Design an enzyme around this catalytic site. Structure first.
Site, mmCIF file in Angstrom:
data_model
loop_
_atom_site.group_PDB
_atom_site.id
_atom_site.type_symbol
_atom_site.label_atom_id
_atom_site.label_comp_id
_atom_site.label_asym_id
_atom_site.label_seq_id
_atom_site.Cartn_x
_atom_site.Cartn_y
_atom_site.Cartn_z
ATOM 1 C CG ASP A 91 -0.287 -3.741 2.763
ATOM 2 O OD1 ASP A 91 -0.238 -3.372 1.558
ATOM 3 O OD2 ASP A 91 -0.262 -2.952 3.741
ATOM 4 C CB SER B 244 2.858 1.702 6.590
ATOM 5 O OG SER B 244 1.563 1.825 7.173
ATOM 6 C CG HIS C 173 -0.540 0.465 2.457
ATOM 7 N ND1 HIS C 173 -0.145 -0.401 3.459
ATOM 8 C CD2 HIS C 173 -0.355 1.715 2.931
ATOM 9 C CE1 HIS C 173 0.288 0.306 4.500
ATOM 10 N NE2 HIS C 173 0.164 1.596 4.210
#
Ligand SMILES: [Cl-]
EC number: 3.4.21.91
Lengths: 46, 150
Positions: free
Chosen positions: B58, B118, B34
């Site tokens: 992901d 992230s 992402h």
């Protein structure tokens, strides 16, 4: 299309990957970073 | 590129924005799908290209297949080595939990950092990376958590 990259995504090294003993003691610890770096400026690459 | 944890910064006219983070190990850079969506990355004038991805987990790696080798086991504490936008790196110790989902049951930590974190590594006591922060998954209870393990 274009032969230029769409976006300039740059990597900047920030820390060694290791378990931090101080964080095991206290639950949280700053990872000393480098001269010692007192503040991260997001807008500058390094 | 040397082994380590990195910030991923995107240039714009106002300067750089930190969009995420990742881990370089054994020649391969690891981050979240992402975050980069497969985009080419640059480090000090050297290009790195996507080599493998798993959109459902992901995850994406650049310059080689997945190298991260940590495996978390119930009961064990880990550390999130968080690289948050605007903050120096910080290690935060936490005990992941098991959560039910439609797909199965996962190990996960709480989403307790900036979304721009992230890709930061979550490490075990051996210093191995058991997962990366920021894989947001929905639990059966309607909570969002950061998945690390199936
Ligand atoms: Cl690892």
């Amino acid at each position: 299309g274009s032969h230029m990259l769409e976006a300039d995504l740059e990597l900047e090294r920030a820390a060694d990957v290791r378990w931090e003993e101080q964080a095991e003691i206290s639950g949280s610890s700053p990872i000393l970073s480098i001269s010692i770096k007192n503040e991260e400026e997001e807008q500058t690459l390094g | 590129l040397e082994d380590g944890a990195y910030r991923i910064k995107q240039k714009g006219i106002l300067g750089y924005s930190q969009i995420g983070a990742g881990v370089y190990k054994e020649g391969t850079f690891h981050t979240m799908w992402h975050v980069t969506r497969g985009a080419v990355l640059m480090h000090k004038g050297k290009r790195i290209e996507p080599s493998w991805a798993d959109v459902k987990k992901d995850l994406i790696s650049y310059g080689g297949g997945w190298k991260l080798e940590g495996e978390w086991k119930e009961g064990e504490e880990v550390q999130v080595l968080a690289l948050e936008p605007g903050k120096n790196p910080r290690a935060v110790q936490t005990k992941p939990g098991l959560f039910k989902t439609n797909t199965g049951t996962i190990g996960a930590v709480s989403l307790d950092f900036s979304p721009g974190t992230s890709g930061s590594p979550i490490v075990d006591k051996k210093g191995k990376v058991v997962g990366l922060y920021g894989n947001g998954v929905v639990t059966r209870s309607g909570a969002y958590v950061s998945a690390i393990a199936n």
